[PDB]
Design an enzyme around this catalytic site. Structure first.
Site: not given
Ligand SMILES: [Cl-]
Ligand SMILES: [Cl-]
Ligand code: NA
Length: 129
Positions: A35, A50
């Site tokens: 990630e 977002s």
């Protein structure tokens, strides 16, 4: 802060993530690797406006407030900037809420695509835990 692999594993274990909701430590380290490359300051903007924040790339549409995601929730009740600290506490506490909401670690796309079904224990091999 850019964590080393075993350094992050130890911090995650201290914060109660080892086997949290049945996910062994290696899953969490693997997810963080893909990630954020273990970088607490990682940010990435999504198509819907977002943004994902921090070592576990937590999304502002649902989990934190960044002042610029209209109509979003703040289910972890934190400013998204708190997720970028060298102290992973905020990220871990919010990740515990996410992984508990019914979909497990599938909430993390990199975990589903790059850790799920692999030998995730390799991510903590050799670490003093
Ligand atoms: Cl593991
Ligand atoms: Cl699950
Ligand atoms: Na939000």
């Amino acid at each position: 802060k850019v964590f080393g692999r075993c350094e992050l594993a130890a911090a995650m274990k201290r914060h109660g993530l080892d086997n949290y909701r049945g996910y062994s430590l290696g899953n969490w380290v693997c997810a963080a690797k893909f990630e954020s490359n273990f970088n607490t300051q990682a940010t990435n903007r999504n198509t819907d406006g977002s943004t994902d924040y921090g070592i576990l790339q937590i999304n502002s549409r649902w989990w934190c407030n960044d002042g610029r995601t209209p109509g979003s929730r703040n289910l972890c009740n934190i400013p998204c900037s708190a997720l970028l600290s060298s102290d992973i506490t905020a990220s871990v506490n919010c990740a515990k809420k996410i992984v508990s909401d019914g979909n497990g670690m599938n909430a993390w796309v990199a975990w589903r695509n790059r850790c799920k079904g692999t030998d995730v224990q390799a991510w903590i091999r050799g670490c003093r835990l």
